[PDB]
Design a protein around this ligand. Structure first.
Ligand code: TYM
Lengths: 324, 333
């Protein structure tokens, strides 16, 4: 059974694009793979931020992943800082990473964490003998560095690490920005009218969907055409992703209908989906004991695996073994 | 409670009389006066590529050498860096409060990079941050080092101050403890270059575990100057070799430079080198005698490492817990 590693930032406010895209895909593959979800608080601190908001955001992210359907009895979910082995391997791998490799990632006032985090990312993955890593385009370089580091270390010391591969197949749910339908909906957009977050209430959803750009076709026609009708196509894709109705089925359903009707149904569909998600979220988020047990159990599972890899790394390097 | 002393040395190369005079001598002398913690920094050692068997052996060599010098495991905490995860943990966190420019300007990074062009690695660059973590974990007040580590120590102070300014009284701001003599012992055939523990030319070096007979021969061949008549006088600019020999002699015997200058009046470099050789040969003979008793007693070295890591972990975990609470991490259950 292959091992899958995903880093979850405790700062991102997840959108319907994040959910209906990758997360929903992965919630349904927890028996197919040994999935690991690491809430990366040690990566978060490369950007200076309020301490109390970071603690809150870590717990927010945990509860939301649980709400979306990550099962802590099937998958391993934990907070990065709870497993010392990440920092330990991070340091070790620094010594097998060229300074040039970090500088060549795509000046004097930048903090060393922002410079060095790709090595920590490599450590995060390689600790768990990870086979597969779902990456977006923005972190393809980082995965390649982790593969380069793994092969370099293995060439010196034997087959200590698995060489991880990208998880290639995409979710098959297309969710674009509401005011810029050529651009994908992304959690890190400054214009939050482009996105629908998972904790938005029905009034917020109605508002943002009514502002979503369409086209000046006369008569208005609800037909799928990414080139000529980007906005209307996005609303159709969003609706299809929520309900499971095909694009041709929806095109037939909205025959002789204006964009107001489409928008009305999209908002209703999206909010119907978010209601069950939000119910589970607030239930988990307000249960301190549950979250504490999930984190404790997750860190214990992670540590047991991570320690085995780190011991092999340390033995290969030649460090004197700790005396327990 | 007593103020805290922390210092470390790398289990790589072979420790010299420079390492001893600049650091280890002070370490031994501070043990009653302060609460002392001494570390074999194996995680720093691997910033220069090590053979795995050499690294393991050198770690244990270094531990036995600390004990041979007079570091007493009943008085001081003695441990191996990699045995305490908190070093790497705090090492990562302090990267986020250290600037790229502070690290790129470091003399050691530049010198080591020029030397090891084929392995200019991120560990070598990030070296000072892990060092700051090493110090700051133990609420350290004093850090006994040689002159060459002054720049690194200064950064650790800046990091402590910067972090404290944001979060409260989390770290002590450490102070350097650099000796008046022997802070920067120089190479015997190149006295404008500091004595290296990994020199390609062994004739530059007085190794702590080297045959005393070999060391005496090296002292006799140490370069001096062309002064006519020869005069034993301290002048680093014009008499680097003679000055370095006086510095070594002063550090061994405890005698001042004015005292030695007076003592060598009417004498030349034969007397100087004879006295340097006698003093150093005697020190190393004694040192090496103790060393083998410790080095071949694996049960004792194993127990010192166990007890030391236990003591260190108690201090380090406390500091790391406060750091993690301050920056906003969810506390581990
Ligand atoms: N020619 C010389 N003359 C006088 N002193 C010298 C000479 N060469 C070296 N030293 C001093 O020896 C100590 C150990 O040096 P290392 O290279 O092992 O090791 C080093 O240079 C440290 N980075 C190890 C370290 C890691 N973390 C720490 C925290 C606190 C103090 C020290 C450390 C040092 O005090 C060094 O200044």
């Amino acid at each position: 059974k292959p091992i899958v590693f995903s880093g979850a930032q405790p700062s991102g406010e997840l959108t319907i694009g994040n959910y209906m895209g990758a997360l929903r895909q992965w919630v349904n593959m927890q028996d197919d793979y040994h999935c690991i979800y690491c809430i990366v608080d040690q990566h978060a601190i490369t950007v200076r931020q309020d301490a109390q908001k970071l603690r809150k955001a870590t717990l927010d992210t945990l509860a939301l992943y649980l709400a979306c359907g990550i099962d802590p009895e099937k998958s391993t979910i934990f907070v990065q800082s709870h497993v010392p082995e990440h920092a330990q391997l991070g340091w070790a791998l620094n010594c097998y990473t060229y300074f040039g490799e970090l500088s060549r990632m795509t000046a004097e006032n930048i903090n060393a964490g922002l410079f060095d985090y790709p090595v920590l990312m490599a450590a995060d993955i390689l600790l768990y003998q990870t086979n597969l890593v779902p990456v977006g385009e923005d972190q393809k370089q980082h995965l390649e560095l982790s593969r380069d580091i793994a092969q370099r270390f293995n060439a010196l010391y034997g087959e200590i690490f698995k060489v991880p591969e990208p998880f290639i197949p995409k979710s098959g749910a297309r969710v674009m920005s509401l005011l810029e339908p050529t651009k994908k909906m992304s959690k890190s957009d400054d214009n939050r009218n482009n996105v629908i977050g998972l904790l938005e209430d029905p009034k917020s959803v109605v508002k943002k969907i009514k502002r979503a750009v369409t086209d000046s076709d006369e008569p208005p026609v609800v037909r799928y055409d990414v080139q000529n009708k980007a906005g209307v196509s996005n609303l159709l894709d969003i609706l299809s992703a929520v309900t499971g109705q095909s694009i041709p089925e929806l095109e037939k359903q909205f025959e002789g209908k204006m964009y107001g009707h489409l928008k009305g149904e999209v908002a209703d569909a999206v909010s119907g989906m978010l209601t069950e998600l939000q119910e589970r979220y607030h239930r988990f988020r307000n249960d301190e004991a549950f979250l504490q047990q999930v984190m404790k159990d997750g860190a214990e599972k992670a540590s047991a695996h991570a320690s085995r890899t780190l011991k092999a790394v340390y033995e290969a390097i030649g460090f004197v073994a700790k005396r327990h």
